[PDB]
Write a protein that binds this ligand. Structure first.
Ligand SMILES: Nc1ncnc2c1ncn2[C@@H]1O[C@H](COP(=O)(O)OP(=O)(O)OP(=O)(O)O)[C@@H](O)[C@H]1O
Ligand SMILES: Nc1ncnc2c1ncn2[C@@H]1O[C@H](COP(=O)(O)OP(=O)(O)O)[C@@H](O)[C@H]1O
Ligand SMILES: [Mg+2]
Lengths: 48, 436, 290, 96, 190
């Protein structure tokens, strides 16, 4: 797709295109921003 | 020791064809027989082996009877055309100056081409040109039905073409479906998945609705989802009472005609894989008897308004007895091009509001064009603008087409079908405009 | 009696129903699947023969008697066309309409066989081929009349009768041409005996030994069982061989075994042979419906 | 030997029970004779009377003679009876 | 065959039976030399012979009508040729070329010239010699002629070429070695 497309794509070398989301604004944005880092209770460490 | 054995290895095709063609009144029968007989064996050898092909002698005799019928129809056509003018009429004189080869090739094409796969149709036409040189089959023109097809296709967001265009093959296939429904009282569509057989049948019913002023009703049944006992109804082994099955219930409903069902036209469509088990009772109906027999002992006579139809991805497990009784139209996968589906998508976007749901579904039929409703909602405007942005990429050689052709090369754990990918893409674009 | 109407297709060869008086007390005739009807010369009175077996046996007897008595009249009428230089199409079509398809084809075959027999008797070692030429001329005239009539628009039953007559007369023309080419000059030559022949003797009092069908050694009698408008078979040389061998086996009291690949006319040829002699054929399928 | 537009070359044919010289058959005691390059030529069917010196041999697939591919008409070199070719069981095999 | 059946009048009947017997021999022995003798091994058994005898009896009884003698010309040769070409022996034949071969045999044997003293049952036997019809008319003469036949039989008796034998043996020769190959290592397990 990057070869045949005219639409700009993400300009980060070692990231697949599938790892990026399209924001409501036109520009791309990585999915990694939308995944929080949480803390799990000791009660449910293996069955959350 | 008690039985005398005789080797009937090879019947005389040529002389049987000669005598039958002479029986139908053909002036030339020797040349026509000597041409048609090798042609059938040529088709049997050259064409790819498929279960539904039948180039045996029964098929040949049926084709020749059809050719005789077409010849007589042409005699009557010329006779009535001259009679409406001022003329002196003689049947023999009219029959003298006609091409018999044109009638025969027309009958052969009309009987075979609907069953032909898209891979085999050009081979068949090459063979036909070889055996019948300088003779071509021009398809009979159905102007009124084609105009109604155009109207319904524009109404249902479907492409229409006049042959050798974008969508010509699909129009031809629905016309063939009309022909087979006219001829036979039972027929099948045996294309692969995603070839437009169910859409073609729906369009045909809604077009004959306008053409003939007769109300089209559809009864779609999945036969394998339901058990055979519920399908055909089961007799209680004790405390004797009859429980009508679904198919028997539909047949009894149309036969009784409480709401005037005899006036209306009703088609029963078995939209599911054909198997020997659930079609045993249907064999009597599909045969020339046209009679459903049940363990209850009741004998339901199929009325002329009913037309038992079939949709199958394939007929791998269909008995030859079931295939023989029914007509058939093979909807090859290259009847629905990618451009047709993209046009359907972009046409659905421009006129179906994406949020209003089902309450406004009925209002779609209230307006024949929905004038003054261009701004039905802001959603319609947004998705129309989105379709305008998306049109350059949906072209016949655009981004989507090249991407799909490349993706078909890639191996997928599940079988990669065209319409699965296209429906996924359309749903994602729907959600894109919803996000906007 | 109405409930009995569905079971006749199992017992009789062609009788799909019985035509009855309005009070269902007298049987007036029989009818086929195609609607072709044979009206009994003498109706079977159910009231005088109340038992089912008795009046059914009388129905079978009257079917045979009336079929023979109508074949007699049909042969008597078609003898005129056999000896005529020109055939009026209207009279021929009227004759076709007046009589059943089975009796029509039988009358044509009987007339052709008797005409060829009289011809071969008349030539009698002199080498004069004029009578067989006359027979061929009459057959060709009838073929031209039928070819002209079949191009017209006809009712379905009359169209089937015309098709059967054409299919029979093409074979008759071929056989007569073969006889003329071979210069056959005696009725007892094998080239004529090997062809199936029909000998109708109206003077016989019994109605099951009137028409005699002969082929080489075999000398069958026509069982006058109503067959309806059956599908005739184009008498190819292979079907002629089948008929010859099968009648030879029947004359020797042996059984018949036409073996070959599928769809080569085996069972249909046997059915056609049985129907030509008027005997009830009953095909038994042998594919998971036995 | 140049092939005409309607002529196709074939090789590997074997002739059982005969020898072909000058495109004419003669009965031979050899078990089999290797046929050289054989030109199959398709011609418009002229209304030509079947000559008395013409024999219609088969062309079997192999020596078992279970499958028949087609038939070939050959002219007889001498005044030999064609029936002798039928009694002798003369034939043609695509392969030995 | 019972003696009374052949001894029945007219006197010519026995000669026909001899020809029929010879015919049934020639087709049968030829089955050894398949695929050369026939395209495939047909079941020309005794039932065909009995059917042929019944046909001959019926036709001669019809033609003679009890006459002690009938001329060789009056014998219905066409009926016999057609029936044993299509009904008796030809029914089993499916190949058209084997049917042609059967027609050739019947036309060569069943003819009026069979009753000539100079008739040759098999021409150019061994390329130089011929086999002549017996000149007798009774059953005993034909039986004695059969008993006095040479013991050394070649394929030329049946119309085949002599090297047909040379073919058959080598086929059996291969049939030997291949059979031994099926024995080489099921018995031997070292
Ligand atoms: N004439 C047409 N023009 C454009 N698109 C079409 C046309 N006919 C069908 N399509 C598209 O093809 C899709 C598949 O056609 P249809 O609904 O008839 O299914 P089908 O071929 O019977 O497949 P399945 O095996 O899934 O039932 C339709 O949903 C529509 O998207
Ligand atoms: N000589 C013939 N003349 C006319 N029709 C024939 C002839 N031979 C075969 N047919 C047709 O071909 C079909 C062959 O089917 P059938 O005879 O029922 O079973 P099979 O041939 O497999 O034994 C028949 O329906 C018959 O109409
Ligand atoms: Mg579908």
């Amino acid at each position: 797709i990057r070869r045949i497309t005219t639409v700009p794509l993400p300009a980060a070398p070692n990231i697949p295109i599938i790892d990026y989301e399209v924001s409501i604004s036109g520009e791309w944005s990585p999915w990694q921003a939308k995944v929080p880092q949480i803390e799990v209770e000791t009660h449910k460490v293996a069955a959350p | 020791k008690l039985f005398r054995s005789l080797a009937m290895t090879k019947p005389d095709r040529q002389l049987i064809a000669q005598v039958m063609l002479y029986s139908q009144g053909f002036r030339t029968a020797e040349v026509l027989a000597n041409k048609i007989v090798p042609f059938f064996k040529l088709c049997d050898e050259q064409l790819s082996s498929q279960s539904h092909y039948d180039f045996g002698l029964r098929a040949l005799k049926s084709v020749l009877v059809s050719a005789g019928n077409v010849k007589r129809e042409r005699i009557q056509k010329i006779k009535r055309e001259k009679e409406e003018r001022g003329e002196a009429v003689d049947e023999g004189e009219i029959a003298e100056n006609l091409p018999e080869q044109e009638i025969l090739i027309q009958s052969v094409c009309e009987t075979m081409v609907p069953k032909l796969v898209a891979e085999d149709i050009p081979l068949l036409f090459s063979l036909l040109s070889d055996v019948f040189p300088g003779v071509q089959y021009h398809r009979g023109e159905m102007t009124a039905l084609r105009e109604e097809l155009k109207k319904v296709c524009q109404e249902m967001y479907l492409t229409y073409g006049d042959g050798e265009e974008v969508g010509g093959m699909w129009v031809e296939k629905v016309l063939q479906l009309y022909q087979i429904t006219q001829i036979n009282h039972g027929l099948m569509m045996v294309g692969p998945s995603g070839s437009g057989k169910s859409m073609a049948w729906r369009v045909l019913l809604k077009a004959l609705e306008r053409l003939e002023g007769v109300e089209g009703v559809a009864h779609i049944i999945d036969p394998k989802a339901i058990s055979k006992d519920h399908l055909y109804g089961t007799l209680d082994p004790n405390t004797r009472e009859w429980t009508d099955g679904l198919f028997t219930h539909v047949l009894r409903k149309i036969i009784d005609n409480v709401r005037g069902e005899l006036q209306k036209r009703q088609w029963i469509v078995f939209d599911g894989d054909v198997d020997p088990e659930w079609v045993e009772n249907l064999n009597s109906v599909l045969d020339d008897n046209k009679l459903l027999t049940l363990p209850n002992g009741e004998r339901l006579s199929l009325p002329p308004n009913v037309r038992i139809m079939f949709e199958v991805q394939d007929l791998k497990y269909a008995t030859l007895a079931t295939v023989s009784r029914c007509g058939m139209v093979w909807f090859s996968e290259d009847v629905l091009s990618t451009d047709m589906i993209f046009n359907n998508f972009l046409a659905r976007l421009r006129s179906i509001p994406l949020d209003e749901g089902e309450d406004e579904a009925q209002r779609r039929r209230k307006g024949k064009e929905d004038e003054g409703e261009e701004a039905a909602s802001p959603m319609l405007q947004i998705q129309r603008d989105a379709a305008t942005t998306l049109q350059p990429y949906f072209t016949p050689n655009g981004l989507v087409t090249k991407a799909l052709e490349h993706a078909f090369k890639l191996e997928h754990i599940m079988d990669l079908t065209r319409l699965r990918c296209l429906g996924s893409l359309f749903s994602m674009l729907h959600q894109a405009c919803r996000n906007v | 009696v109405a409930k009995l109407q569905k079971h006749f297709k199992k017992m009789f060869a062609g009788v799909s129903s019985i035509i009855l008086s309005e009070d269902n007390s007298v049987v007036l005739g029989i009818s086929s699947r195609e609607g072709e009807e044979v009206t009994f010369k003498t109706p079977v009175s159910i009231t005088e023969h109340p038992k089912i077996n008795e009046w059914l046996t009388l129905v079978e007897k009257e079917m045979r008697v009336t079929l023979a008595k109508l074949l007699a009249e049909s042969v008597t009428e078609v003898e005129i066309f056999g000896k005529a230089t020109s055939i009026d199409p209207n009279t021929y079509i009227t004759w076709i309409d007046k009589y059943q398809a089975q009796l029509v084809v039988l009358s044509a075959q009987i007339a052709w066989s008797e005409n060829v027999e009289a011809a071969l008797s008349s030539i009698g070692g002199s080498g004069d081929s004029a009578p067989l030429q006359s027979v061929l001329s009459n057959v060709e005239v009838t073929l031209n009349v039928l070819a002209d009539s079949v191009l017209m628009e006809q009712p379905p039953l009359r169209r089937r009768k015309l098709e059967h007559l054409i299919t029979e007369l093409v074979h008759q023309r071929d056989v007569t041409r073969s006889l003329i080419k071979s210069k056959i000059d005696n009725a007892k030559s094998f080239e004529w005996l090997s062809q199936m022949r029909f000998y109708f003797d109206p003077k016989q009092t019994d109605v099951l030994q009137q028409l005699s069908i002969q082929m080489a050694n075999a000398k069958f009698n026509y069982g006058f069982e109503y067959l309806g408008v059956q599908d005739k078979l184009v008498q190819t040389p292979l079907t002629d061989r089948c008929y010859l061998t099968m009648t030879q086996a029947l004359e020797a009291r042996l059984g018949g075994s036409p073996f070959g690949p599928a769809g080569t006319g085996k069972t249909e040829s046997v059915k056609a042979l049985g129907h030509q002699l008027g005997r009830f054929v009953l095909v038994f399928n042998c594919d998971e419906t036995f | 030997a140049t092939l005409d537009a309607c002529s196709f070359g074939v090789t590997g044919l074997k002739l059982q029970g005969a020898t072909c010289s000058n495109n004419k058959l003669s009965l031979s005691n050899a078990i089999s004779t290797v046929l050289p390059l054989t030109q199959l030529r398709w011609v418009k069917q002229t209304n030509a009377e079947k000559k008395a010196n013409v024999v219609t041999l088969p062309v079997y697939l192999n020596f078992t003679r279970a499958d028949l591919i087609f038939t070939v008409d050959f002219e007889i070199a001498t005044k030999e009876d064609p029936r002798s070719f039928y009694e002798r069981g003369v034939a043609v095999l695509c392969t030995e | 065959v019972p003696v009374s059946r052949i001894c029945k009048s007219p006197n010519e009947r026995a000669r026909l039976y001899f020809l029929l017997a010879w015919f049934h021999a020639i087709i049968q022995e030829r089955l050894r030399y398949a695929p050369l003798g026939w395209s495939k091994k047909y079941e020309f058994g005794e039932s065909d012979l009995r059917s042929a005898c019944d046909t001959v009896d019926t036709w001669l009884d019809d033609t003679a009508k009890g006459r002690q003698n009938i001329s060789p010309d009056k014998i219905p040769w066409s009926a016999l040729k057609t029936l044993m070409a299509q009904s008796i022996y030809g029914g089993r034949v499916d190949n058209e070329f084997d049917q042609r071969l059967l027609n050739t045999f019947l036309e060569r044997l069943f003819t009026t010239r069979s009753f000539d003293s100079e008739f040759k049952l098999a021409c150019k036997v061994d390329g130089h010699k011929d086999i002549q019809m017996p000149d007798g008319i009774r059953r005993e003469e034909f039986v004695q002629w059969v008993e006095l036949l040479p013991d050394t039989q070649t394929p030329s008796w049946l119309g085949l070429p002599n090297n047909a034998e040379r073919v058959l043996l080598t086929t059996q020769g291969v049939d030997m070695i291949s059979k031994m190959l099926k024995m080489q290592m099921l018995e031997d397990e070292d």
